[PDB]
Structures are given as structure tokens and as C-alpha cells.
Amino acid sequence: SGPVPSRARVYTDVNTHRPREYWDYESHVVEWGNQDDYQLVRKLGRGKYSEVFEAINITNNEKVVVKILKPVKKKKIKREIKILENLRGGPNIITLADIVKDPVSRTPALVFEHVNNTDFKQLYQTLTDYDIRFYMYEILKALDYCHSMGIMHRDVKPHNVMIDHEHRKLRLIDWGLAEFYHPGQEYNVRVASRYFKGPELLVDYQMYDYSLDMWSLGCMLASMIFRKEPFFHGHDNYDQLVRIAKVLGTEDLYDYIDKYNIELDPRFNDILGRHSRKRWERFVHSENQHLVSPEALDFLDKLLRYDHQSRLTAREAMEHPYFYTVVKD
Numbered sequence: 001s002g003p004v005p006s007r008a009r010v011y012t013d014v015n016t017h018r019p020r021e022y023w024d025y026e027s028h029v030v031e032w033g034n035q036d037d038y039q040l041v042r043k044l045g046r047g048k049y050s051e052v053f054e055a056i057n058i059t060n061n062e063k064v065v066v067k068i069l070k071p072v073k074k075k076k077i078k079r080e081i082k083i084l085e086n087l088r089g090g091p092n093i094i095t096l097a098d099i100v101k102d103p104v105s106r107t108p109a110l111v112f113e114h115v116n117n118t119d120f121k122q123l124y125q126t127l128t129d130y131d132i133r134f135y136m137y138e139i140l141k142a143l144d145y146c147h148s149m150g151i152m153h154r155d156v157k158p159h160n161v162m163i164d165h166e167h168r169k170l171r172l173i174d175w176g177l178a179e180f181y182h183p184g185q186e187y188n189v190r191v192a193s194r195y196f197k198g199p200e201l202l203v204d205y206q207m208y209d210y211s212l213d214m215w216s217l218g219c220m221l222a223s224m225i226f227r228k229e230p231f232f233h234g235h236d237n238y239d240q241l242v243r244i245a246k247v248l249g250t251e252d253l254y255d256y257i258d259k260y261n262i263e264l265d266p267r268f269n270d271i272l273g274r275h276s277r278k279r280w281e282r283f284v285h286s287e288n289q290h291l292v293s294p295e296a297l298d299f300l301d302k303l304l305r306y307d308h309q310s311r312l313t314a315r316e317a318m319e320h321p322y323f324y325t326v327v328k329d
């Protein structure tokens with residue numbers, strides 16, 4: 001009775017071999033800077049958990065980004081800080097430069113390196129086939145790094161990938177939903193943005209792992225090579241799974257939930273239907289064919305699999321022939 005357990009197939013026990021303080025973020029003691037070192041310039045955005053500003057370090061005229069955390073969840077605050085410090089210096093991980101106490105909100109304000117980002121809505125319309133492969137490889141470097149450090153991002157999406165296209169620089173940002181992977185642990189399924197939620201989240205399977213990020217990455221790849229953003233455009237979390245099933249088919253979906261002894265929410269009875277798997281060539285047309293190759297479709301197919309245990313890992317993905325044409329380092 002109940003779901004079948006699952007474990008990551010890589011980096012499974014990295015945290016249990018760590019000192020407790022590495023992953024015990026509740027015990028972390030924050031070292032504070034001087035908030036008056038930074039002057040806010042303009043607000044860049046606001047979400048449920050933070051407000052983000054362009055700012056200047058007034059001690060050396062340096063551009064920085066300041067993320068003022070909202071006082072909603074406090075252990076979520078220590079979690080993000082500890083993860084950012086643990087991952088600092090890793091390939092294409094945003095660098096946390098300082099932590100100050102904002103005088104107005106009385107909450108932590110995170111100071112990050114600045115990236116000359118262009119909005120993905122404008123940038124993805126300009127990317128060549130080579131650019132897509134290049135930036136995909138850069139994202140994979142960041143994902144393999146954090147996974148190898150025992151951390152899943154859980155909010156991979158174009159909005160959380162800052163790209164300075166003039167300088168071909170990429171940073172993975174917003175670690176507010178990131179979590180330490182502990183084998184056998186049941187996690188909250190209310191993570192990631194709707195269009196990038198893995199099937200495991202949508203069927204309410206809690207014992208997921210780093211492979212969630214690889215589904216989200218596959219969703220990004222599909223939107224880039226097919227020029228369709230987002231690729232799976234659900235109107236809610238239930239319709240999101242139906243949209244996936246209209247592409248991947250319902251037979252493999254039922255095989256997936258049967259393998260883990262998962263029972264679908266009965267509200268899917270009236271909306272899921274019966275769908276064959278579609279060949280990826282259905283989504284190729286004159287406006288995206290220059291972005292599609294046999295290698296791209298083979299890669300995408302190995303990311304967008306219902307069974308989280310069957311997806312390519314970040315390291316395996318970097319070995320894929322899709323990246324043979326990319327000059328590295």
C-alpha cells in the first residue's frame with residue numbers, strides 16, 4: 001500500500017557524507033555586511049518572496065543586483081543563503097557577493113554580481129542553432145555542479161537564466177526554491193513554474209530528485225528549437241499534465257504511475273483521454289527547421305521522459321552528440 005520509493009541514480013548519498021552544517025541550513029549563522037555600501041537604482045521585479053533591484057556599490061561605482069527577501073518563510077531564507085554560499089564559485093552559478101539587513105523591510109537583502117541580461121522573450125527569437133547548443137551546455141555545467149553538490153534547483157525556467165548575449169555569459173539565478181537532496185525524503189510538489197513542472201510534481205509523487213531539473217531543461221530546449229514558448233502550455237496544473245500527455249502519449253504515462261504505484265487524482269478521469277505518442281517531427285515547420293537536427297531531437301527525447309529515473313543526468317547530457325559541434329572552454 002502506498003507509492004513505491006525512488007532514489008536519484010547519481011550523487012545519491014553526497015549529503016550524508018557531509019558535515020552536518022553543510023546541509024543543516026537551520027543552524028546557519030549569517031555574516032552581515034553594511035547596507036549603506038549599496039544604493040538602490042531601480043526596481044527590476046517583484047515576486048511572492050522577494051523584490052529585486054538594480055543597485056550600485058557606492059564604494060567603487062560597481063553595478064550589483066539586490067534581492068530584498070520578503071518576511072514570509074524564515075527557514076526558506078536560511079536555505080537560499082546556505083545554498084548560495086555552498087555553490088559560490090561553481091560554473092555559471094550566480095555569485096552571492098554580500099548579505100545585508102535592509103533597513104526598511106528588516107529582512108535579509110542578498111547582493112549579487114550584475115549580468116547585462118536581455119529578456120528571454122526577445123532573446124530566444126534571435127538565437128541560432130549554434131547559440132542554443134552553446135547556452136544549453138552552459139546551463140548543464142551549472143546543473144551538474146549543483147547536483148554534484150547535493151542540491152536541486154527546482155525552478156529551472158528561462159526567467160531564471162540570465163544571459164549577457166553581447167559577451168556570451170550565462171548565470172543560473174533565483175535559488176529560492178532550491179533544496180538539499182536526501183535519499184528517501186518526500187518533498188513539496190509545489191515547486192517550479194507550471195510550464196516546467198515535471199510529471200512527478202503533476203501526479204503528486206513526492207520522492208523526486210535532481211532529475212526534476214532535467215525535465216524543466218527539456219521543456220526549455222523544446223521551446224527554443226521549436227520556437228514555441230512555452231512548449232507545454234497548460235491552463236492549470238491539471239491541464240498541464242494533459243498537455244504533456246497529448247505529446248508523450250497516455251500509455252507511457254500510465255506505465256509511469258503504475259511503476260511507482262501512484263494513483264492519479266480522479267479529476268483526470270474526465271480530461272486525460274487517450275493519446276498516442278507523437279513523433280517530434282510533428283512540431284517541425286518552415287519557421288523552426290533550421291534549429292532542428294536529428295541530434296537535437298534525440299537529446300530532447302532523452303530529457304522529456306515521464307519516468308524521472310530514465311532521464312539523462314546533467315553529466316550524461318553533456319556527453320550527447322548534440323554538443324559535438326560546440327567549442328568548449
Ligand SMILES: COc1ccc(/N=C/c2c(O)ccc3c2oc2cc(Cl)c(O)c(Cl)c23)cc1
Pocket residue numbers: 044050052065067094112113114115116117118162173174175176
Ligand atoms: C535590463 O533589465 C534587466 C537587466 C539585468 C537584470 N539582472 C537581473 C539579475 C542579475 O543581473 C543577477 C542576479 C539576479 C538578477 O535577477 C535576479 C532575480 C532573482 Cl529572484 C535572483 O535570485 C537573482 Cl540571483 C537575480 C534584470 C533586468
